Design a protein around this nucleic acid. Sequence first.
RNA 1: UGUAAAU
Length: 402
Amino acid sequence: LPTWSLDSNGEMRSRLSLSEVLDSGDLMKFAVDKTGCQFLEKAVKGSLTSYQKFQLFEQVIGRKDDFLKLSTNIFGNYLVQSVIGISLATNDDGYTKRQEKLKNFISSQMTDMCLDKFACRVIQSSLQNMDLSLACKLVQALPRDARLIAICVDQNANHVIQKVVAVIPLKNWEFIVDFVATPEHLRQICSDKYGSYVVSTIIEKLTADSMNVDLTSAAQNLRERALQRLMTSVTNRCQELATNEYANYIIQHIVSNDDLAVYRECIIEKCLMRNLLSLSQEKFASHVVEKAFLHAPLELLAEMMDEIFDGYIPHPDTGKDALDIMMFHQFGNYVVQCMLTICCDAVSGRRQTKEGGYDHAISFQDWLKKLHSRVTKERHRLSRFSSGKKMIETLANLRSTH
RNA sequence: UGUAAAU
């Protein structure tokens, strides 16, 4: 901080004016100081004259090096977002020029600004507040090589990608979807704490749900094409995504969403079917199996139930079947529990048994009787476990009301 | 008895 701005104690004087700081040439010193930046942040919220704006624009977003220094500063990045705000609100000669100079500045340092904890906020800010056409150009400056992977898995830059997906039309970031759907990129990105969220956010935006009813038919066709490209790669690696600690949320999201029903059905038929006993014993994939049971259309649900009740050869030495294994397994027990809940919801009217006017109630009753007969015969061993007690108590409650 | 984001 420059000595002319301090008092008898080395403290910043009160009663300082904005134009004093602007005229002094020491704005950069105030902007990286906590107290000075607080003053500037508050001062620029007032009624500024045209010349005060002129000085602000030139000293904060006028020169690349000072812009970058402020954008990557723990305090300056806030002043940068404020000045960009004022710039967007000031409809003078320079309105588009300032945006383009700003777009060019960020474009030239795009990777490093995304990876920076503070500059990545300046980027997200510009993406959603700048004129859409300039914001779209900013998206094009994203790298196309291994840096884009590093961006998706970064603790800070992953939010830049999610911001792009939220506020930019799909045409401008289609290359990200094709990048992500590249098989080797997909595995790295989905299997990461941050990148998993990136892929889920992409899929959500690519879904024709109620939040996309405002799209044109032409935008829906483009959306559907990107969705199919991404879904093809995902379903091709579905088993390894379903069993990964971070990617399993992606399979769950596809399976649980009615507006992705055809992709749900393809995952169930091509990935989980004939693997239910194995995947039910997996820490992460057992969550995927539950969602499949909960959301499967009735014909696939019947096939999944029949795979558990009668798809596996009993153990040759003891005669234990798949149900025996799963009911006592550390993860499989939640799947049986889910199966029991579905059947009880059906008989008790809390679940639709008609699918297209055709009633499958008889089938739910069949599955419930199988679960009840097993639980009744194994009640003593099952009473030793919480999951077992839960099943026993769910059953007794049910037929004392029906 | 069972898992996830940065001023």
